[PDB]
Design a protein around this ligand. Structure first.
Ligand SMILES: Cc1cc2nc3c(=O)[nH]c(=O)nc-3n(C[C@H](O)[C@H](O)[C@H](O)COP(=O)(O)O)c2cc1C
Ligand code: SF4
Ligand code: SF4
Ligand code: SF4
Ligand code: FES
Ligand code: FES
Lengths: 227, 442, 72, 156
C-alpha cells in the first residue's frame, strides 16, 4: 500500500489502519482509546487526521486514523490546520472535568494524558464552570482507584473484559457520568488486573504497592530483567 | 381546512382510521383491503421481486434519515448459507416533536403487522422484533393483541398462507433512552447491551443483530409497504408529482390553533400545513420560527414557510426534513431558553461513547444557562460556534451530536441578538493569588 | 513548586563550620507560616479527597452524582 | 437478602426463550423485577446475572444506562413530567411549579410518606396534546396548574 502523509510518500501495510501505520513510521498522532493489542473502536476521537479523496483535493474530511484503513494510494494530512484544532479541542474537552491533581497523582511524569495535552499544544483554560466528580472504589490491595481522572477512553473495560476475560469490571451510568469500575467494592478477581496501570492512560488505576513508596519515573533506576 | 375526504387512493395510511379513535382489529382491517398485499406478496411474488418493487416505488425511510428502502434491502448478502436474517421495527420514536408512530401503532396495528410480514418475506427474515418504547403502553397492548389475532388467523407463525414461509413477531419494550432510536444502538439494545451505536462499515445488512443480516426500518416505512404491494408501484409513483414518492405523516405542533397530524403528499408547503391544517397560530401570538422535523433539525424563519416539505428542498434551506413534524415558535418564546432546553435534552441523552458529544454538549448547556441568567462572558458565542463546527458529521461517532448542534447553529445564525443580550459580565476564570503578579495578556 | 511550599527568603547568614551541617533536613526548613504567599492552598484546588475536603468540595467542583441516581 | 420469586424467574426464562442469546433478556428481566418490587436492588442485579448466565457488571451497566430502570428506591407512584421542547413551549414549567408546590419536593426526590416521586422525563410522544405527564402507567395530557391537585389525589 502507498499513502501520502503531509506531502511525503510512504509504503505501509494495507491490512493496518492509518494510526498504527503512521505511528510505525515515526509520525506523532495523539490517541487515547486505541491500543495495539486491543484494536480500534473510535471512542476518544483524538486521532483525527484530514483525508483527501485524491492528490487534487483541497477540502478533505476529518477521519479517525485508527478507524481508517491504510489502503493503497491514501492521501491524509496530520499537520493540517483543522485537524490540529480538532485534536486540541478534544484535549480541551477532556480537560474541562479533569481534577487539579498532577502533583498528588501517581501517574505524573508517566501519564499519557499529560503527554497528549502537551503534544496537542493545549495549555490555556477558557472553561470556567464546574467539574464533575466521582466517588472512588476499593479495588483490593494491588490497584488504587481514582475515578475523577478518567477521560472515558474505554481502554480498561476493553482490555479487562474482551482481552483478559475478566467479569467484574465494567462501564456504568450514562452521558457524562460514565463510571468505570466494579459493581461493588471488592478485589479485582482477574489474574491480569495489574496491566490496568499501563492500559489506563490516566491515573485512575494506579499501582497501590508502588503508591506506598512512590517516586516519579525520572527518579527511577531501571534494568531489563526477567520475572 | 377541516373537511378531509380520506380515500384509499390518496390516503393509504389513514383512510381506515375510525372516527372515535378506536383501534381497528383483524376483522375490521380485513374487511377493508386487509392483508391483500401480504397475500399477493406471499403467493405470487419472489422476495427479490418484492425488493425490486419497493426499490422502484421510490419508498424512502421515514425515520428521519430519508435513505431509500429498496437499496437498504438490496445490501443483504446473496448466499443461502446465511439464513438467520432479522427484521427490526424502530418503534422507539424518542425524538421530541414526534408523535406519528404512536398514532399508527395505537389505532392501526395490523397495518404494521402486515408491513413487517411483507418485509420479512422480502428480506427472507425468520424473525421480527418491534423495538417499542416503554412509554407506549396502549400501543404495546394493541400490537400484542394484533399479533395474537394474526397468529390465530394463520398470518403469523409456521407455514403462513400455505407458502412455507416461517415468521414470528415479538414486541421488545424499551427502557427509556433516546439513543436507542439509532439503528446500530437499537441493535445493541435489542441484544441486551448498553445502547452504544456501532461503527459502519460493516452495515447491519451484512452483520447486524447477533452477527446476522439485519434490516432496521421505521414504523411508517413498514406501514407504507403494504399499500405499495396491494395497489401497485405505478399507483405509488402517481400520487405526488415530486422527487419523493408517496405520502407522509406531516403535522404542526406548538401554540397553533389545531395541533395534530395529517397524511399529506410530499411537496406540500409548510405554510399550507400551518394555515389550512394547523389553523395558524393562536390568538395574540405571532409566528417567529419553526423546526421542520423534530428537535434535531435546524430552525427556519417565516421566509422559509413557503418551501415544499421535501428532503432536498429543506436540504438547500439549511435544515433537514426529518420526521416532517414541524414545531412552531412564537414571539413569546426566548430563543436562548428554547435552545437551552434542547441542549439539556441532547446532553443528557448522550450515550457517553465519544468525546465531542459527551464533553462538549454539557459545555454548551452551561454556556446557555449562563446566557439565560444574564451571566454570559465574551467568547461564549464563539465557543458555541466552535462547538457546532467540531460536532458535525464524521467528527462524532454517531449522528446524535450533529442533530444536537443543528438548532444551536440555526438559532445563532438567525436570532443572534438574544445570545448577545445574554452576555453581561467580563470574562474571568482566574482568582487573584496574592503574591503572584498575573500575566496580563492582550 | 505547584503548591508554593518551597520558597527563597531574604536571609543570607548561613555559614557553617562543617560541610555536613549544610545539609538541611525537613525540621531545618519548615517555618511556622505561609511565607511570601499568604493565602494559597493547593489542597483547596485538588480533587483528591483528604480530611476536611470530601469529593466535590474543592474549587470549581460539582457534587458527585451516583450512576444509580433516578435523574436522567 | 434478595431472592427471585417463582413468577419472576418464570417470566425471565419465558423472555429468554424469545431470543437467540439469553443476554438479550436483561432489560426485560430488570423491568420485571422493577414491576414486582418498584425498583431494582443490588441483589436483584446479582440474581438476574446468575439466571441469565452473564456477569453482574454487564447487568449493572445495563441497569444504570437506562433511565427507566431504577437503582434507587422510589415512592408508590412515579410522576414523570415531560421537560422537552414542545412541552416547554406549551408551558411545562407551570406544571412543574404546581407539582413542587403540592408535593414540597425537588425533581428527583421522594415525598416523606413515600407516596410520590417526581421525575423529569424526555418527550412522551404526545406533543400535540402538551404539556404531558406520565404517572405510573397513565399518560395525562392537556395539563393545567389548577388541575394538578385534582390529578394527584386520585393516586393514593
Ligand atoms: C440520535 C438518533 C436517534 C434516532 N431515533 C430514531 C427513532 O426514535 N425512531 C426512528 O425510527 N429512527 C430514529 N433514528 C434514525 C435511525 O438511525 C434509522 O435511520 C431509522 O430508525 C430506520 O431507518 P429508516 O428511516 O430507513 O426506516 C435516530 C437516529 C439518531 C442518530
Ligand atoms: S491522570 Fe495525568 S493529567 Fe490527570 S492528574 Fe494524573 S498526571 Fe495529571
Ligand atoms: S478508567 Fe482509564 S482506561 Fe478506563 S476509560 Fe477511564 S481513562 Fe480510559
Ligand atoms: S455522538 Fe458519540 S457520545 Fe453522543 S450519542 Fe453518538 S456515539 Fe454516543
Ligand atoms: S484513538 Fe482513534 S478515536 Fe481513539
Ligand atoms: S415534547 Fe413533551 S410530549 Fe413531546
Amino acid at each position: 500500500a502507498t499513502i501520502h502523509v503531509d506531502g511525503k510518500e510512504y509504503e505501509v501495510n494495507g491490512a493496518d489502519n492509518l494510526l498504527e501505520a503512521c505511528l510505525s513510521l515515526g509520525l506523532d498522532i495523539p490517541y487515547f482509546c486505541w491500543h495495539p493489542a486491543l484494536g480500534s473502536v473510535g471512542a476518544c476521537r483524538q486521532c483525527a487526521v484530514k483525508q483527501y479523496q485524491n492528490a487534487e483535493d483541497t477540502r478533505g474530511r476529518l477521519v479517525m486514523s485508527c478507524m481508517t484503513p491504510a489502503s493503497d494510494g491514501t492521501f491524509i494530512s496530520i499537520d493540517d490546520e483543522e485537524a490540529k484544532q480538532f485534536r486540541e479541542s478534544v484535549v480541551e474537552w477532556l480537560m474541562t472535568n479533569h481534577p487539579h491533581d498532577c502533583p498528588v497523582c501517581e501517574e505524573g511524569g508517566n501519564c499519557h494524558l499529560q503527554d497528549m495535552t502537551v503534544m496537542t499544544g493545549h495549555s490555556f483554560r477558557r472553561y470556567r464552570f464546574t467539574k464533575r466528580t466521582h466517588r472512588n472504589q476499593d479495588l483490593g490491595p494491588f490497584i488504587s482507584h481514582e475515578m475523577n481522572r478518567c477521560i472515558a477512553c474505554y481502554r480498561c473495560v476493553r482490555y479487562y473484559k474482551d482481552y483478559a476475560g475478566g467479569t467484574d469490571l465494567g462501564v456504568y451510568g450514562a452521558h457524562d457520568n460514565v463510571y468505570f469500575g466494579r459493581p461493588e467494592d471488592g478485589t479485582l478477581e482477574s489474574e491480569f488486573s495489574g496491566n490496568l496501570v499501563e492500559i489506563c492512560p490516566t491515573g485512575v488505576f494506579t499501582d497501590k504497592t508502588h503508591s506506598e513508596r512512590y517516586n516519579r519515573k525520572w527518579d527511577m533506576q531501571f534494568a531489563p530483567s526477567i520475572c | 381546512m377541516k373537511n378531509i375526504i380520506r380515500t384509499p387512493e390518496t390516503h393509504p395510511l389513514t383512510w381506515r382510521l375510525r372516527d372515535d379513535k378506536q383501534p381497528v382489529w383483524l376483522d375490521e382491517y380485513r374487511s377493508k383491503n386487509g392483508y391483500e398485499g401480504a397475500r399477493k406478496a406471499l403467493t405470487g411474488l419472489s422476495p427479490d421481486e418484492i425488493v425490486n418493487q419497493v426499490k422502484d416505488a421510490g419508498l424512502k425511510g421515514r425515520g428521519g434519515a430519508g435513505f431509500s428502502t429498496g437499496l437498504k434491502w438490496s445490501l443483504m448478502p446473496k448466499d443461502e448459507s446465511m439464513n438467520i436474517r432479522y427484521l427490526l421495527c424502530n418503534a422507539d420514536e424518542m425524538e421530541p416533536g414526534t408523535y406519528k408512530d404512536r398514532l399508527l401503532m395505537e389505532q392501526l396495528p395490523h397495518l404494521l403487522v402486515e408491513g413487517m410480514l411483507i418485509s420479512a418475506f422480502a428480506l427472507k427474515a425468520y424473525r421480527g422484533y418491534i423495538f417499542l418504547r416503554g412509554e407506549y403502553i396502549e400501543a404495546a397492548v394493541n400490537l400484542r393483541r394484533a399479533i395474537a389475532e394474526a397468529t390465530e388467523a394463520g398470518l403469523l407463525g409456521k407455514n403462513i398462507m400455505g407458502t412455507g414461509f416461517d415468521f414470528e413477531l415479538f414486541v421488545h419494550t424499551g427502557a427509556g433512552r433516546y439513543i436507542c432510536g439509532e439503528e446500530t444502538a437499537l441493535i445493541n439494545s435489542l441484544e441486551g447491551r448498553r445502547a452504544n451505536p456501532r461503527s459502519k462499515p460493516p452495515f447491519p445488512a451484512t452483520s447486524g443483530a447477533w452477527g446476522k443480516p439485519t434490516c432496521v426500518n421505521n414504523v411508517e416505512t413498514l406501514c407504507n409497504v403494504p399499500a405499495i404491494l396491494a395497489n401497485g408501484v405505478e399507483w405509488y409513483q402517481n400520487i405526488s408529482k415530486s422527487k419523493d414518492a408517496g405520502t407522509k405523516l406531516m403535522g404542526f405542533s406548538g401554540r397553533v390553533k389545531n395541533p395534530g397530524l395529517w397524511e399529506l403528499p410530499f411537496g406540500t408547503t409548510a405554510r399550507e400545513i400551518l394555515e389550512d391544517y394547523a389553523g395558524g397560530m393562536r390568538d395574540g401570538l405571532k409566528f417567529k420560527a419553526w423546526q421542520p422535523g423534530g428537535a434535531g433539525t435546524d430552525f427556519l424563519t417565516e421566509a422559509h414557510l413557503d418551501l415544499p416539505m421535501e428532503f432536498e428542498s429543506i436540504g438547500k434551506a439549511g435544515s433537514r426534513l426529518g420526521t416532517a413534524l414541524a414545531m412552531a415558535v412564537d414571539h413569546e418564546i426566548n430563543m436562548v431558553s428554547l435552545v437551552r432546553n434542547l441542549e439539556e435534552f441532547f446532553a443528557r441523552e448522550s450515550c457517553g461513547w465519544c468525546t465531542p458529544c459527551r464533553d462538549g454538549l454539557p459545555w454548551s448547556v452551561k454556556i446557555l444557562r449562563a446566557l439565560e441568567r444574564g451571566e454570559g462572558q465574551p467568547g461564549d458565542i464563539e465557543t458555541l460556534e466552535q462547538l457546532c463546527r467540531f460536532l458535525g458529521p464524521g467528527k462524532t461517532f454517531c449522528a446524535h451530536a450533529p442533530g444536537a448542534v443543528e438548532p444551536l447553529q440555526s438559532a445563532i445564525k438567525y436570532f443572534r441578538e438574544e445570545f448577545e443580550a445574554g452576555i453581561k459580565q467580563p470574562f474571568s476564570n482566574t482568582h487573584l493569588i496574592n503574591g503572584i503578579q498575573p500575566n496580563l495578556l492582550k | 513548586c505547584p503548591t508554593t511550599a518551597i520558597q527563597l527568603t531574604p536571609d543570607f547568614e548561613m555559614g557553617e563550620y562543617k560541610r555536613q551541617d549544610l545539609v538541611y533536613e525537613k525540621e531545618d526548613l519548615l517555618i511556622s507560616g505561609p511565607g511570601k504567599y499568604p493565602e494559597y492552598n493547593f489542597y483547596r484546588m485538588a480533587g483528591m479527597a483528604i480530611d476536611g475536603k470530601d469529593k466535590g468540595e474543592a474549587e470549581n467542583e460539582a457534587k458527585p452524582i451516583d450512576v444509580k441516581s433516578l435523574l436522567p | 437478602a434478595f431472592e427471585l420469586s417463582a413468577a419472576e424467574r418464570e417470566a425471565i426464562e419465558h423472555e429468554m426463550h424469545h431470543y437467540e442469546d439469553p443476554r438479550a433478556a436483561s432489560i426485560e428481566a430488570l423491568k420485571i423485577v422493577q414491576k414486582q418490587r418498584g425498583w431494582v436492588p443490588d441483589g436483584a442485579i446479582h440474581a438476574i446475572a446468575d439466571v441469565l448466565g452473564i456477569p453482574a457488571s454487564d447487568v449493572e451497566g445495563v441497569a444504570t444506562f437506562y433511565s427507566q430502570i431504577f437503582r434507587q428506591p422510589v415512592g408508590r407512584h412515579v410522576i414523570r413530567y415531560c421537560d422537552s421542547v414542545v412541552c416547554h413551549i406549551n408551558g411545562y414549567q407551570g406544571i412543574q411549579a404546581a407539582l413542587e408546590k403540592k408535593l414540597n419536593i425537588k425533581p428527583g426526590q421522594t415525598t416523606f410518606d413515600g407516596r410520590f416521586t417526581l421525575l423529569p422525563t424526555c418527550c412522551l410522544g404526545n406533543c400535540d396534546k402538551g404539556p404531558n405527564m406520565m404517572i405510573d402507567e397513565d399518560t395525562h395530557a392537556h395539563l393545567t396548574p389548577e388541575a394538578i391537585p385534582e390529578l394527584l389525589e386520585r393516586y393514593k
